[PDB]
Design a protein around this ligand. Sequence first.
Ligand code: NA
Length: 424
Amino acid sequence: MVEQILAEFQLQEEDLKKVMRRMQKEMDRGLRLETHEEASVKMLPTYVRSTPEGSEVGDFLSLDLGGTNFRVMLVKVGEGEEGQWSVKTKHQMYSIPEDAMTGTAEMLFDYISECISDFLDKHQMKHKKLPLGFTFSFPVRHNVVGLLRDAIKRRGDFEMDVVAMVNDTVATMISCYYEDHQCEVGMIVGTGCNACYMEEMQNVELVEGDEGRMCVNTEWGAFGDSGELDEFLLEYDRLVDESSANPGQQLYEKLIGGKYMGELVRLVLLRLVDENLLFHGEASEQLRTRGAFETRFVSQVESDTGDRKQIYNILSTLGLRPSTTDCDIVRRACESVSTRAAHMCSAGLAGVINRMRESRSEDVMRITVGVDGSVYKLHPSFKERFHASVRRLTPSCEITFIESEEGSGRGAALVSAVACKKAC
Ligand code: NA
């Protein structure tokens, strides 16, 4: 039958809790110096910390280099004549000498280095070790991160000025922080899936400091790459993981990420049509093609349970002859696949949140989460189930969601959301 098949996607309370646990078991594993390397969930330190030394989350140093003119931007969070909250901004544009612009990468950066060093020096932000963003502009008439390190390294001096920051997620957090200074958890659930939170300084064994809180990039997409979920995968997810250009790698992702979501639905569908349950057992040369069933569709489906029109057209234009039932079948497939994808997500985000409650022992944790991504932004059902399944695993925690700003990504969304919050 069918109800039996899709049933394999179920994931009851217990099931989640286990995942939620096995995640935390991994977060510490990656956070622990003795194993931070061989770990599965990298849990990389971002240094977008906030400690008694003065370092604030909003603090940030962007670097836009494009053409013969590269300019830097400084951002540091303050208190104000009242103890409110402020965000000063400082711009400075350096020009690359001719004998340098037409030189070598080594030479080019040697310059950018000096300039930065100077710039920080002039603003007393030397050795502060702050987040470094990268933007690119292109003049029009009427890897860097590494090269920079080498240069900074060449200088022979203290290598404590900047620290790379390119993860789009971190910026999601930082971005939301400016709007809601209660945001301590960033998350990007779209083509792929990833998150970060504000860990306690005394937990990041890589960092020297111990007092205060610092954001941490989990890169949990790799979760389960060490069998941590082996007993939760299905035949479909397998066909996927075992057909991707990165077999065995990033499994947790290949479960939430709308990069394969559509594909799973296809397999799950192709599965049924094989055991004579769908389309009178006979798929189109189209439906029988990898990627042919785009995520884009799944969202169009769940977005409206009012009629089959949409389901009809997708399938119809897929080279099939849908039936009043055929549709309901497909619907059920999508909903099952998406919901599983949400629940698995709820698990982890929860572990992060729970673990964060345990930290600051207190009544109720009023925390905010910054989210961005195609899945979390174009899959109504997904979002709805995802919010609940989460709140229903985080006892005594007030979780408020806030999407990321409109029109921007990494070092960009940041520098912007801030240049704006500064104009005030
Ligand atoms: Na995005």
